[PDB]
């Protein structure tokens, strides 16, 4: 409630908020106002919001100095670049003048176009069904452990995102694209109701962006169709994805009978070298498992060939199996541990990969018929 | 490439 | 002279040579062999060459271990990636086998396709007319001071490159695109014949890439149609560009009567902020000079406006002049000094910009009619 | 934009 919005703020109080709330913006222009940030002044607070219609990011900035309430929207990139370009310590005075938003500091003056705050989209009202609070580092671990396995544009649209699931005292993430799957769970120190929602892939990426890893805790609220995350002075809200996500419990290989264990770095570097001579599009490599040995081979349409032999721990029947080497490298890069375990069955069945020393995360990769 | 489901 | 090329070399002796000689490669495939490096073994030396037909880069690597002479060509990126992906300290054994080139280290084996060394292009034979040797840091200064002013694809093709000129005891570079010009000269401690050649823009960039700034000196040979630079174990050769390059002596403003001096960083930051609200394509900003003051204004098609006022040193008639702000920022970024001098005449004439404390470099920017 | 030559 106010027609003459005005505030004055220190530059260093604005810069990180402006960067954060601009996260959802970018890409194809559609509705003009989506390239703008909503500014609202009231009762000691400046709020800044950016949206792409599917998600929204809000920052709150405490206002010390005399301010007058109101709201407008201004071009996000230009406003950020102006503030960032002012000198360290600058005081930034902002005020609406007619249909222009003025930004003043020193003898620098910028008159920006605006679009009406009344036109700025809102996410529909909704009610929270579960709420819990956890360290940022825990949420970062959960997402980093799994996010590479989300689909991008699968027709199975429930795959273009990440399952967040509460069970007992644990929060779990699951991501799969039909060809590989990642699951990770972490205790969060409170008894939770059971709930399973799919966060869109772009919202996963934005939630990750808001975690600086510091000690401001993450508060999560989940509704039937939305998720909200509060960290520090920021509030992120996203729509959820419809559909029945796959049950990871039924995707984990049943009773794999062949157990190989190898050094993570040695395995990763061998796959990385072999990948060089794999087909650029299909990426297939062949694994041959024999007593205490793994052989990896790759070839390409030019008939070039890579071969790597590694000493490993394996007792069991010999077998051969093909994989997309990118999927294997993605898992090994996410494990970052000393020894890996691969659990195999046969050449046409998935394999489970995990840290030999931890069960918090598990990975499943479906083979290729080479 | 095979699928998990 | 040898049909069975073979060598063994330490990985860390190969990596920087392979990176360097791959410089000219990339972009549109034409003749297949241009994506390959030429390897030649003879008499204690492995030579590696990459070319794009206009330039070539050669590295020499001393061979300690038994080797057998010969030559082949292999895919540059794949070979580099294989060597880089092997472990630190690895010994790399390479040998031609029929039409394949084998790379072995540990229990890693890579069979690469080849193309015949006989098919690898050569630059035509030529004779050097002038030669001189100078510190790498001097050449780096000369190029960095001017390279941003080269044209890219001007129909005046002599502009798509950099003039290198010897005069007295100095080496000079000049670059211009018809809209702005940069010139820099440095003493090099020897009496030189007078010579003026145009190095193609891509060759300028490659020569810069080969300068690590260390203390291996740069030896330059100039012929009528080629230039060659020797640094350490590398030799770069480029064709020259035909045409009469402009004479910078006639481009420097004659007797500019208005002399402004300002802080370099303050001026740069003011132009950088004003640029935000300049036309995205045409980039025009207006400068108004008055007693001890500079005002910079920018507007755009949306009628947004930036204005910056700066205290400066200026006594003289008031005037207004328009510039492409990118051209001004490029100069200020290259000067990196405390105080700048602008030398003006009128609104339709070029301005000269230099460090207030050094005359080794000078910049000329032609205005815009706003 | 004007030209130098």
Tab-separated table of N, CA, C and O in Angstrom, chain C residues 200-298:
chain	number	residue	atom	x	y	z
C	200	UNK	N	48.545	-11.903	-39.867
C	200	UNK	CA	47.096	-12.159	-39.796
C	200	UNK	C	46.633	-12.245	-38.348
C	200	UNK	O	47.358	-12.730	-37.467
C	201	UNK	N	45.371	-11.849	-38.115
C	201	UNK	CA	44.866	-11.799	-36.738
C	201	UNK	C	44.999	-13.149	-36.021
C	201	UNK	O	45.360	-13.193	-34.834
C	202	UNK	N	44.686	-14.261	-36.704
C	202	UNK	CA	44.812	-15.542	-36.029
C	202	UNK	C	46.257	-15.867	-35.697
C	202	UNK	O	46.523	-16.539	-34.690
C	203	UNK	N	47.206	-15.394	-36.513
C	203	UNK	CA	48.600	-15.621	-36.189
C	203	UNK	C	49.045	-14.781	-35.003
C	203	UNK	O	49.895	-15.217	-34.215
C	204	UNK	N	48.523	-13.559	-34.889
C	204	UNK	CA	48.809	-12.738	-33.709
C	204	UNK	C	48.381	-13.481	-32.449
C	204	UNK	O	49.106	-13.525	-31.441
C	205	UNK	N	47.168	-14.025	-32.478
C	205	UNK	CA	46.621	-14.717	-31.323
C	205	UNK	C	47.472	-15.940	-30.990
C	205	UNK	O	47.780	-16.215	-29.825
C	206	UNK	N	47.898	-16.682	-32.018
C	206	UNK	CA	48.745	-17.856	-31.786
C	206	UNK	C	50.127	-17.475	-31.241
C	206	UNK	O	50.653	-18.146	-30.338
C	207	UNK	N	50.734	-16.416	-31.785
C	207	UNK	CA	52.019	-15.956	-31.259
C	207	UNK	C	51.897	-15.589	-29.786
C	207	UNK	O	52.752	-15.958	-28.971
C	208	UNK	N	50.825	-14.869	-29.434
C	208	UNK	CA	50.589	-14.554	-28.038
C	208	UNK	C	50.503	-15.815	-27.183
C	208	UNK	O	51.051	-15.844	-26.069
C	209	UNK	N	49.820	-16.854	-27.688
C	209	UNK	CA	49.622	-18.090	-26.941
C	209	UNK	C	50.938	-18.758	-26.619
C	209	UNK	O	51.048	-19.459	-25.615
C	210	UNK	N	51.937	-18.585	-27.480
C	210	UNK	CA	53.187	-19.298	-27.284
C	210	UNK	C	54.099	-18.619	-26.275
C	210	UNK	O	55.079	-19.227	-25.843
C	211	UNK	N	53.777	-17.398	-25.849
C	211	UNK	CA	54.601	-16.638	-24.920
C	211	UNK	C	54.115	-16.964	-23.525
C	211	UNK	O	53.003	-16.587	-23.139
C	212	UNK	N	54.915	-17.728	-22.811
C	212	UNK	CA	54.655	-17.995	-21.407
C	212	UNK	C	55.193	-16.895	-20.510
C	212	UNK	O	55.063	-16.998	-19.289
C	213	UNK	N	55.807	-15.857	-21.082
C	213	UNK	CA	56.373	-14.775	-20.299
C	213	UNK	C	57.685	-15.086	-19.612
C	213	UNK	O	58.347	-14.150	-19.144
C	214	UNK	N	58.091	-16.355	-19.545
C	214	UNK	CA	59.337	-16.741	-18.919
C	214	UNK	C	60.526	-16.157	-19.657
C	214	UNK	O	60.400	-15.324	-20.555
C	215	UNK	N	61.708	-16.627	-19.281
C	215	UNK	CA	62.933	-15.978	-19.722
C	215	UNK	C	63.578	-16.584	-20.970
C	215	UNK	O	64.624	-16.089	-21.410
C	216	UNK	N	62.989	-17.609	-21.571
C	216	UNK	CA	63.433	-18.022	-22.903
C	216	UNK	C	63.151	-16.888	-23.878
C	216	UNK	O	61.989	-16.489	-24.017
C	217	UNK	N	64.146	-16.357	-24.572
C	217	UNK	CA	63.900	-15.196	-25.425
C	217	UNK	C	63.195	-15.586	-26.706
C	217	UNK	O	63.163	-16.757	-27.106
C	218	UNK	N	62.595	-14.573	-27.311
C	218	UNK	CA	61.872	-14.723	-28.556
C	218	UNK	C	62.802	-14.287	-29.685
C	218	UNK	O	63.290	-13.146	-29.695
C	219	UNK	N	63.056	-15.198	-30.630
C	219	UNK	CA	63.792	-14.859	-31.835
C	219	UNK	C	62.816	-14.758	-33.004
C	219	UNK	O	62.069	-15.721	-33.260
C	220	UNK	N	62.835	-13.614	-33.706
C	220	UNK	CA	61.908	-13.338	-34.801
C	220	UNK	C	62.689	-13.253	-36.103
C	220	UNK	O	63.712	-12.572	-36.170
C	221	UNK	N	62.215	-13.967	-37.130
C	221	UNK	CA	62.718	-13.832	-38.489
C	221	UNK	C	61.569	-13.355	-39.373
C	221	UNK	O	60.464	-13.908	-39.321
C	222	UNK	N	61.826	-12.352	-40.198
C	222	UNK	CA	60.818	-11.818	-41.100
C	222	UNK	C	61.342	-11.947	-42.518
C	222	UNK	O	62.454	-11.492	-42.819
C	223	UNK	N	60.528	-12.559	-43.380
C	223	UNK	CA	60.765	-12.594	-44.802
C	223	UNK	C	59.816	-11.664	-45.532
C	223	UNK	O	59.069	-10.894	-44.925
C	224	UNK	N	59.829	-11.772	-46.862
C	224	UNK	CA	58.921	-10.926	-47.635
C	224	UNK	C	57.456	-11.335	-47.460
C	224	UNK	O	56.571	-10.471	-47.520
C	225	UNK	N	57.185	-12.625	-47.201
C	225	UNK	CA	55.819	-13.139	-47.162
C	225	UNK	C	55.547	-14.017	-45.952
C	225	UNK	O	54.479	-14.638	-45.878
C	226	UNK	N	56.480	-14.103	-45.012
C	226	UNK	CA	56.302	-14.967	-43.855
C	226	UNK	C	56.971	-14.338	-42.648
C	226	UNK	O	57.879	-13.513	-42.779
C	227	UNK	N	56.527	-14.761	-41.468
C	227	UNK	CA	57.173	-14.413	-40.209
C	227	UNK	C	57.348	-15.715	-39.443
C	227	UNK	O	56.509	-16.618	-39.513
C	228	UNK	N	58.443	-15.811	-38.695
C	228	UNK	CA	58.717	-16.970	-37.862
C	228	UNK	C	59.178	-16.509	-36.486
C	228	UNK	O	59.923	-15.529	-36.372
C	229	UNK	N	58.701	-17.193	-35.450
C	229	UNK	CA	59.055	-16.868	-34.076
C	229	UNK	C	59.541	-18.153	-33.395
C	229	UNK	O	58.872	-19.184	-33.467
C	230	UNK	N	60.698	-18.079	-32.743
C	230	UNK	CA	61.270	-19.198	-32.022
C	230	UNK	C	61.266	-18.865	-30.543
C	230	UNK	O	61.783	-17.814	-30.146
C	231	UNK	N	60.673	-19.745	-29.744
C	231	UNK	CA	60.701	-19.584	-28.295
C	231	UNK	C	60.923	-20.957	-27.688
C	231	UNK	O	60.117	-21.866	-27.907
C	232	UNK	N	62.023	-21.112	-26.946
C	232	UNK	CA	62.278	-22.409	-26.333
C	232	UNK	C	62.368	-23.490	-27.396
C	232	UNK	O	63.084	-23.348	-28.395
C	233	UNK	N	61.609	-24.567	-27.215
C	233	UNK	CA	61.573	-25.658	-28.180
C	233	UNK	C	60.458	-25.533	-29.212
C	233	UNK	O	60.157	-26.526	-29.861
C	234	UNK	N	59.885	-24.341	-29.392
C	234	UNK	CA	58.795	-24.131	-30.332
C	234	UNK	C	59.192	-23.175	-31.451
C	234	UNK	O	59.963	-22.248	-31.235
C	235	UNK	N	58.617	-23.414	-32.636
C	235	UNK	CA	58.812	-22.568	-33.815
C	235	UNK	C	57.453	-22.328	-34.466
C	235	UNK	O	56.786	-23.282	-34.895
C	236	UNK	N	57.051	-21.066	-34.525
C	236	UNK	CA	55.789	-20.670	-35.126
C	236	UNK	C	56.087	-19.963	-36.427
C	236	UNK	O	56.968	-19.115	-36.462
C	237	UNK	N	55.372	-20.328	-37.492
C	237	UNK	CA	55.529	-19.668	-38.783
C	237	UNK	C	54.145	-19.272	-39.298
C	237	UNK	O	53.212	-20.076	-39.238
C	238	UNK	N	54.031	-18.064	-39.826
C	238	UNK	CA	52.784	-17.606	-40.435
C	238	UNK	C	53.037	-16.927	-41.774
C	238	UNK	O	54.064	-16.285	-41.974
C	239	UNK	N	52.084	-17.078	-42.689
C	239	UNK	CA	52.019	-16.183	-43.826
C	239	UNK	C	51.725	-14.767	-43.361
C	239	UNK	O	51.191	-14.550	-42.270
C	240	UNK	N	52.092	-13.790	-44.186
C	240	UNK	CA	51.777	-12.391	-43.972
C	240	UNK	C	50.584	-11.996	-44.829
C	240	UNK	O	50.242	-12.682	-45.789
C	241	UNK	N	49.956	-10.874	-44.474
C	241	UNK	CA	48.830	-10.319	-45.235
C	241	UNK	C	49.315	-9.267	-46.236
C	241	UNK	O	50.139	-8.416	-45.907
C	242	UNK	N	48.759	-9.288	-47.455
C	242	UNK	CA	49.092	-8.297	-48.483
C	242	UNK	C	48.348	-6.984	-48.230
C	242	UNK	O	47.309	-6.935	-47.568
C	243	UNK	N	48.864	-5.906	-48.802
C	243	UNK	CA	48.160	-4.639	-48.727
C	243	UNK	C	48.982	-3.557	-48.080
C	243	UNK	O	49.991	-3.844	-47.426
C	244	UNK	N	48.576	-2.305	-48.263
C	244	UNK	CA	49.259	-1.169	-47.651
C	244	UNK	C	48.566	-0.831	-46.334
C	244	UNK	O	47.453	-0.293	-46.318
C	245	UNK	N	49.218	-1.130	-45.227
C	245	UNK	CA	48.607	-0.798	-43.957
C	245	UNK	C	48.596	0.726	-43.765
C	245	UNK	O	49.507	1.420	-44.225
C	246	UNK	N	47.590	1.268	-43.070
C	246	UNK	CA	47.579	2.713	-42.783
C	246	UNK	C	48.809	3.163	-42.008
C	246	UNK	O	49.376	2.415	-41.215
C	247	UNK	N	49.188	4.422	-42.215
C	247	UNK	CA	50.315	5.037	-41.519
C	247	UNK	C	49.801	5.704	-40.243
C	247	UNK	O	49.141	6.752	-40.300
C	248	UNK	N	50.117	5.109	-39.081
C	248	UNK	CA	49.616	5.669	-37.830
C	248	UNK	C	50.027	7.130	-37.648
C	248	UNK	O	49.317	7.886	-36.976
C	249	UNK	N	51.178	7.539	-38.214
C	249	UNK	CA	51.659	8.909	-38.033
C	249	UNK	C	50.685	9.916	-38.614
C	249	UNK	O	50.611	11.073	-38.156
C	250	UNK	N	49.931	9.495	-39.625
C	250	UNK	CA	48.957	10.358	-40.281
C	250	UNK	C	47.569	10.224	-39.670
C	250	UNK	O	46.691	11.035	-39.978
C	251	UNK	N	47.368	9.212	-38.817
C	251	UNK	CA	46.105	9.003	-38.115
C	251	UNK	C	46.070	9.704	-36.753
C	251	UNK	O	45.000	10.138	-36.310
C	252	UNK	N	47.209	9.849	-36.080
C	252	UNK	CA	47.221	10.605	-34.829
C	252	UNK	C	46.612	11.985	-35.070
C	252	UNK	O	46.973	12.651	-36.052
C	253	UNK	N	45.702	12.453	-34.210
C	253	UNK	CA	45.144	13.799	-34.394
C	253	UNK	C	46.222	14.866	-34.483
C	253	UNK	O	47.187	14.879	-33.715
C	254	UNK	N	46.036	15.777	-35.423
C	254	UNK	CA	46.946	16.903	-35.571
C	254	UNK	C	46.562	18.033	-34.607
C	254	UNK	O	45.440	18.550	-34.647
C	255	UNK	N	47.501	18.406	-33.750
C	255	UNK	CA	47.389	19.553	-32.861
C	255	UNK	C	46.061	19.622	-32.101
C	255	UNK	O	45.371	20.639	-32.134
C	256	UNK	N	45.671	18.558	-31.431
C	256	UNK	CA	44.449	18.663	-30.627
C	256	UNK	C	44.616	19.753	-29.568
C	256	UNK	O	45.663	19.879	-28.936
C	257	UNK	N	43.601	20.602	-29.435
C	257	UNK	CA	43.732	21.799	-28.614
C	257	UNK	C	43.079	21.671	-27.241
C	257	UNK	O	43.239	22.566	-26.407
C	258	UNK	N	42.387	20.567	-26.966
C	258	UNK	CA	41.656	20.393	-25.718
C	258	UNK	C	42.239	19.185	-25.004
C	258	UNK	O	42.260	18.080	-25.548
C	259	UNK	N	42.773	19.411	-23.816
C	259	UNK	CA	43.497	18.372	-23.090
C	259	UNK	C	42.814	18.117	-21.759
C	259	UNK	O	42.788	18.994	-20.886
C	260	UNK	N	42.255	16.920	-21.610
C	260	UNK	CA	41.577	16.509	-20.402
C	260	UNK	C	42.409	15.422	-19.738
C	260	UNK	O	42.937	14.531	-20.402
C	261	UNK	N	42.453	15.456	-18.415
C	261	UNK	CA	43.128	14.405	-17.679
C	261	UNK	C	42.261	13.953	-16.526
C	261	UNK	O	41.688	14.780	-15.809
C	262	UNK	N	42.156	12.642	-16.365
C	262	UNK	CA	41.227	12.068	-15.411
C	262	UNK	C	41.853	10.804	-14.854
C	262	UNK	O	42.747	10.200	-15.465
C	263	UNK	N	41.319	10.354	-13.723
C	263	UNK	CA	41.753	9.075	-13.188
C	263	UNK	C	41.272	7.929	-14.072
C	263	UNK	O	40.109	7.887	-14.475
C	264	UNK	N	42.172	6.982	-14.370
C	264	UNK	CA	41.834	5.896	-15.299
C	264	UNK	C	40.703	5.031	-14.758
C	264	UNK	O	39.744	4.726	-15.476
C	265	UNK	N	40.799	4.625	-13.485
C	265	UNK	CA	39.791	3.721	-12.945
C	265	UNK	C	38.451	4.415	-12.807
C	265	UNK	O	37.422	3.830	-13.154
C	266	UNK	N	38.456	5.663	-12.325
C	266	UNK	CA	37.190	6.380	-12.215
C	266	UNK	C	36.551	6.549	-13.581
C	266	UNK	O	35.324	6.421	-13.721
C	267	UNK	N	37.352	6.865	-14.585
C	267	UNK	CA	36.782	7.045	-15.913
C	267	UNK	C	36.215	5.727	-16.426
C	267	UNK	O	35.107	5.679	-16.970
C	268	UNK	N	36.981	4.635	-16.265
C	268	UNK	CA	36.550	3.327	-16.751
C	268	UNK	C	35.257	2.887	-16.083
C	268	UNK	O	34.333	2.408	-16.754
C	269	UNK	N	35.156	3.063	-14.760
C	269	UNK	CA	33.950	2.601	-14.078
C	269	UNK	C	32.741	3.445	-14.467
C	269	UNK	O	31.613	2.919	-14.573
C	270	UNK	N	32.954	4.748	-14.721
C	270	UNK	CA	31.852	5.600	-15.143
C	270	UNK	C	31.372	5.199	-16.528
C	270	UNK	O	30.161	5.088	-16.766
C	271	UNK	N	32.311	4.979	-17.461
C	271	UNK	CA	31.897	4.498	-18.785
C	271	UNK	C	31.232	3.133	-18.697
C	271	UNK	O	30.275	2.862	-19.428
C	272	UNK	N	31.734	2.250	-17.825
C	272	UNK	CA	31.159	0.908	-17.731
C	272	UNK	C	29.713	0.964	-17.231
C	272	UNK	O	28.851	0.204	-17.699
C	273	UNK	N	29.435	1.806	-16.236
C	273	UNK	CA	28.062	1.937	-15.772
C	273	UNK	C	27.189	2.575	-16.842
C	273	UNK	O	26.072	2.105	-17.104
C	274	UNK	N	27.672	3.649	-17.481
C	274	UNK	CA	26.867	4.304	-18.501
C	274	UNK	C	26.537	3.355	-19.640
C	274	UNK	O	25.420	3.394	-20.175
C	275	UNK	N	27.476	2.475	-19.987
C	275	UNK	CA	27.288	1.540	-21.085
C	275	UNK	C	26.044	0.690	-20.899
C	275	UNK	O	25.439	0.235	-21.896
C	276	UNK	N	25.673	0.422	-19.649
C	276	UNK	CA	24.552	-0.469	-19.370
C	276	UNK	C	23.291	0.024	-20.077
C	276	UNK	O	22.450	-0.792	-20.511
C	277	UNK	N	23.125	1.344	-20.165
C	277	UNK	CA	21.934	1.963	-20.725
C	277	UNK	C	22.189	2.558	-22.115
C	277	UNK	O	21.370	3.331	-22.613
C	278	UNK	N	23.263	2.144	-22.773
C	278	UNK	CA	23.491	2.498	-24.161
C	278	UNK	C	22.805	1.488	-25.090
C	278	UNK	O	22.464	0.362	-24.698
C	279	UNK	N	22.621	1.898	-26.337
C	279	UNK	CA	22.037	1.025	-27.340
C	279	UNK	C	22.871	-0.252	-27.456
C	279	UNK	O	24.104	-0.190	-27.564
C	280	UNK	N	22.211	-1.418	-27.381
C	280	UNK	CA	22.956	-2.685	-27.335
C	280	UNK	C	23.767	-2.944	-28.591
C	280	UNK	O	24.771	-3.681	-28.556
C	281	UNK	N	23.314	-2.411	-29.714
C	281	UNK	CA	24.017	-2.604	-30.964
C	281	UNK	C	25.008	-1.482	-31.254
C	281	UNK	O	26.144	-1.746	-31.661
C	282	UNK	N	24.584	-0.232	-31.095
C	282	UNK	CA	25.398	0.902	-31.533
C	282	UNK	C	26.245	1.535	-30.439
C	282	UNK	O	27.242	2.188	-30.770
C	283	UNK	N	25.886	1.328	-29.171
C	283	UNK	CA	26.769	1.556	-28.034
C	283	UNK	C	27.134	3.030	-27.837
C	283	UNK	O	28.153	3.338	-27.192
C	284	UNK	N	26.348	3.968	-28.360
C	284	UNK	CA	26.774	5.354	-28.311
C	284	UNK	C	26.582	5.986	-26.944
C	284	UNK	O	25.547	5.812	-26.293
C	285	UNK	N	27.594	6.744	-26.516
C	285	UNK	CA	27.523	7.568	-25.322
C	285	UNK	C	27.989	8.974	-25.686
C	285	UNK	O	28.792	9.158	-26.609
C	286	UNK	N	27.459	9.954	-24.962
C	286	UNK	CA	27.772	11.350	-25.186
C	286	UNK	C	28.678	11.843	-24.060
C	286	UNK	O	28.408	11.606	-22.876
C	287	UNK	N	29.736	12.527	-24.438
C	287	UNK	CA	30.640	13.147	-23.489
C	287	UNK	C	30.464	14.653	-23.589
C	287	UNK	O	30.530	15.210	-24.680
C	288	UNK	N	30.261	15.315	-22.461
C	288	UNK	CA	30.228	16.773	-22.425
C	288	UNK	C	31.384	17.238	-21.560
C	288	UNK	O	31.464	16.892	-20.367
C	289	UNK	N	32.290	18.002	-22.156
C	289	UNK	CA	33.477	18.497	-21.478
C	289	UNK	C	33.267	19.965	-21.125
C	289	UNK	O	32.874	20.762	-21.990
C	290	UNK	N	33.512	20.322	-19.885
C	290	UNK	CA	33.404	21.700	-19.438
C	290	UNK	C	34.480	21.901	-18.388
C	290	UNK	O	35.181	20.952	-18.042
C	291	UNK	N	34.589	23.117	-17.858
C	291	UNK	CA	35.665	23.416	-16.919
C	291	UNK	C	35.743	22.385	-15.800
C	291	UNK	O	34.818	22.236	-14.996
C	292	UNK	N	36.845	21.651	-15.786
C	292	UNK	CA	37.150	20.620	-14.793
C	292	UNK	C	36.018	19.612	-14.603
C	292	UNK	O	35.836	19.056	-13.516
C	293	UNK	N	35.276	19.286	-15.656
C	293	UNK	CA	34.202	18.320	-15.472
C	293	UNK	C	33.961	17.529	-16.740
C	293	UNK	O	34.045	18.083	-17.836
C	294	UNK	N	33.646	16.247	-16.582
C	294	UNK	CA	33.184	15.417	-17.680
C	294	UNK	C	31.811	14.863	-17.303
C	294	UNK	O	31.626	14.337	-16.200
C	295	UNK	N	30.845	15.003	-18.199
C	295	UNK	CA	29.545	14.367	-18.027
C	295	UNK	C	29.405	13.320	-19.135
C	295	UNK	O	29.697	13.606	-20.297
C	296	UNK	N	29.020	12.105	-18.774
C	296	UNK	CA	28.808	11.024	-19.723
C	296	UNK	C	27.327	10.671	-19.662
C	296	UNK	O	26.797	10.419	-18.575
C	297	UNK	N	26.667	10.625	-20.816
C	297	UNK	CA	25.281	10.206	-20.839
C	297	UNK	C	25.074	9.102	-21.855
C	297	UNK	O	25.718	9.074	-22.908
C	298	UNK	N	24.175	8.187	-21.528
C	298	UNK	CA	23.802	7.114	-22.436
C	298	UNK	C	22.293	6.969	-22.437
C	298	UNK	O	21.654	7.028	-21.381
